[PDB]
Amino acid sequence: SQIGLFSKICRVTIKTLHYYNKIGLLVPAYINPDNGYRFYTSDQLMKFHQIASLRQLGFTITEIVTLTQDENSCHIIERRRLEIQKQIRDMADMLSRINHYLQHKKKERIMLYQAALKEIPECIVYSKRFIVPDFSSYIKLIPPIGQEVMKANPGLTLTTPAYCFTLYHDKEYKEKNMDVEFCEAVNDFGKNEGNIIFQVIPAITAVTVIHKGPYDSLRNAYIYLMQWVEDNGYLLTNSPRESYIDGIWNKQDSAEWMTEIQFPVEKV
Amino acid sequence: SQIGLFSKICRVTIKTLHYYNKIGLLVPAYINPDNGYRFYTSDQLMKFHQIASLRQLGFTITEIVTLTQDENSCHIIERRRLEIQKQIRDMADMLSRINHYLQHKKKERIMLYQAALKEIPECIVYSKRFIVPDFSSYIKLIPPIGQEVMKANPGLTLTTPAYCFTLYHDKEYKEKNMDVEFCEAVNDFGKNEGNIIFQVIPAITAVTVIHKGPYDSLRNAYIYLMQWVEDNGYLLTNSPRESYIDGIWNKQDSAEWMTEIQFPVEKV
Numbered sequence: 442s443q444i445g446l447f448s449k450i451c452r453v454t455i456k457t458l459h460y461y462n463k464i465g466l467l468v469p470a471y472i473n474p475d476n477g478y479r480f481y482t483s484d485q486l487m488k489f490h491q492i493a494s495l496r497q498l499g500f501t502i503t504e505i506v507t508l509t510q511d512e513n514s515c516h517i518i519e520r521r522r523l524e525i526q527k528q529i530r531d532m533a534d535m536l537s538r539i540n541h542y543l544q545h546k547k548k549e550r551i552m553l554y555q556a557a558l559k560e561i562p563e564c565i566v567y568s569k570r571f572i573v574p575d576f577s578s579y580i581k582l583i584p585p586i587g588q589e590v591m592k593a594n595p596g597l598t599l600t601t602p603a604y605c606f607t608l609y610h611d612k613e614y615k616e617k618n619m620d621v622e623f624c625e626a627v628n629d630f631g632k633n634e635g636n637i638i639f640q641v642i643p644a645i646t647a648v649t650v651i652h653k654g655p656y657d658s659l660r661n662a663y664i665y666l667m668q669w670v671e672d673n674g675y676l677l678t679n680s681p682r683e684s685y686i687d688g689i690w691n692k693q694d695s696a697e698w699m700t701e702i703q704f705p706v707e708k709v
Numbered sequence: 710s711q712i713g714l715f716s717k718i719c720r721v722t723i724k725t726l727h728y729y730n731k732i733g734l735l736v737p738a739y740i741n742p743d744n745g746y747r748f749y750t751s752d753q754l755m756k757f758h759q760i761a762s763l764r765q766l767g768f769t770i771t772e773i774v775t776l777t778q779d780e781n782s783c784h785i786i787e788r789r790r791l792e793i794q795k796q797i798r799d800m801a802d803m804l805s806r807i808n809h810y811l812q813h814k815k816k817e818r819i820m821l822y823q824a825a826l827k828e829i830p831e832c833i834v835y836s837k838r839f840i841v842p843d844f845s846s847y848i849k850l851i852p853p854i855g856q857e858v859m860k861a862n863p864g865l866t867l868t869t870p871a872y873c874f875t876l877y878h879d880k881e882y883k884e885k886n887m888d889v890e891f892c893e894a895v896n897d898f899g900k901n902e903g904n905i906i907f908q909v910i911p912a913i914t915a916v917t918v919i920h921k922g923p924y925d926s927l928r929n930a931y932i933y934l935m936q937w938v939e940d941n942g943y944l945l946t947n948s949p950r951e952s953y954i955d956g957i958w959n960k961q962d963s964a965e966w967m968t969e970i971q972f973p974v975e976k977v
């Protein structure tokens with residue numbers, strides 16, 4: 442059976458048979474030496490059937506070489522079983538994500554906020570946890586802390602890139618009784634004089650959305666994020682953070698400012 | 710903020726930012742013409758955030774380059790949703806097949822048969838449907854059926870490759886007095902003579918198993934295939950075909966016989 446007839450028997454292209462010969466997966470029975478023409482037999486169709494049966498299960502080519510040459514190799518198929526289970530979980534989450542994205546673009550003509558699930562590493566921060574009467578009053582008392590901590594810790598260099606955020610330790614919603622904890626990441630340990638202390642903040646996977654503009658609309662992102670958090674079945678494992686990209690330090694106009702709200706979540 | 714500090718903000722590789730810049734997506738703010746350095750600003754971070762959100766959604770890069778600026782293009786999102794649904798369906802299929810594979814390999818030392826789905830086209834066959842008392846009498850009676858057909862039709866040329874097969878239109882296991890229909894696909898129309906007719910057999914999606922051995926033990930294969938259709942949640946849509954590829958006519962050794970069982974099947 443010449444390669445054309447055989448390629449139509451097994452119903453696959455010629456280049457596929459060329460490739461399977463090139464990698465040594467399916468070798469013709471008899472190659473004519475001067476022309477190089479490949480001729481197969483029935484016992485090449487018998488092997489191509491096994492090859493295609495394994496290849497419909499997603500096995501990579503080298504995995505098929507091993508599956509056909511090494512017997513009692515059930516650990517590689519089980520490994521592939523676990524990987525396929527992981528991709529099914531991931532694809533179902535993707536389904537929920539794309540349903541929510543389509544649900545939004547029909548709900549609003551503009552996508553104001555996209556939600557990204559990113560991993561944030563562990564940090565070394567100086568932290569002050571305290572009650573706040575008003576979030577507007579919360580903004581002013583931070584540069585005093587900036588003076589104070591650099592005073593008490595000489596030569597303490599903050600991490601680059603700068604990570605300056607807020608934990609919201611409140612389990613429900615209110616506007617004037619916010620129990621917050623301001624954390625900012627530095628390089629080394631330090632002195633703990635004052636309400637300012639040092640602590641290690643563990644690495645977390647968190648869904649974050651970046652809101653750009655003034656802070657009075659920031660709650661929007663939270664409602665959105667909360668929707669997201671409930672829609673895709675994620676569970677909020679820790680208190681929500683808010684990391685400051687743009688603000689009074691870089692830029693003077695308060696409408697081009699930008700913060701990023703981060704929800705610590707776990708997949709359940 | 711050079712590309713290193715920006716790549717450390719997003720926790721992304723320098724090569725990814727390079728690739729994005731090459732493709733036109735996420736062009737940086739300032740490319741210094743003396744040394745070609747790349748400086749990024751936080752607005753580029755805001756753009757990269759939605760880039761990373763879509764890349765976390767499964768969207769290919771050309772789809773992100775078309776989605777990040779032409780904000781009206783929405784049909785491409787239900788289209789991606791349909792692609793993901795197709796993949797989830799096929800992955801669930803694959804998962805059922807891998808679990809069935811694992812149970813069967815843990816069962817027996819030797820994997821005798823290996824099922825594979827393939828799309829068999831429609832084909833113009835000549836057919837003869839009739840009753841047989843046993844399998845051996847049937848095996849002996851096919852060749853005179855072929856001889857009668859080649860005599861009654863002058864100029865009848867078979868199709869290459871030779872798709873010559875039979876159908877068991879019974880639904881339960883009938884060992885004797887079988888209602889069997891032999892058929893073979895030909896090049897073009899002939900004239901109906903006797904009880905042999907011509908017709909066009911429609912294209913199917915068939916789960917196939919190649920039996921190597923004498924014909925009286927093809928039965929095993931069917932049971933296996935049956936388990937495969939009940940286990941992996943497929944459904945037998947039509948009478949099972951059995952195609953003869955290699956056998957007593959081409960090689961007189963009984964142990965080099967090849968028959969390709971084809972269950973017409975549909976997904977549930």
Ligand code: 118
Pocket residue numbers: 583584586587588603604605606625685688689690
């Ligand atoms: C110590 C404590 C706070 C700040 Sb900053 C800041 C943070 C990261 C990168 C640049 C600046 C600040 C504010 C105004 C003027 C100058 C610096 C800051 C304040 C509130 C909330 C978040 C960050 C700086 C040092």
Ligand code: 118
Pocket residue numbers: 848851852854855856871873893953954955958
């Ligand atoms: C019409 C009917 C049967 C056969 Sb064949 C056969 C040939 C090629 C591929 C598959 C089957 C046959 C028999 C003798 C000499 C040459 C060809 C055949 C034989 C036994 C059982 C079933 C079919 C051929 C034409």
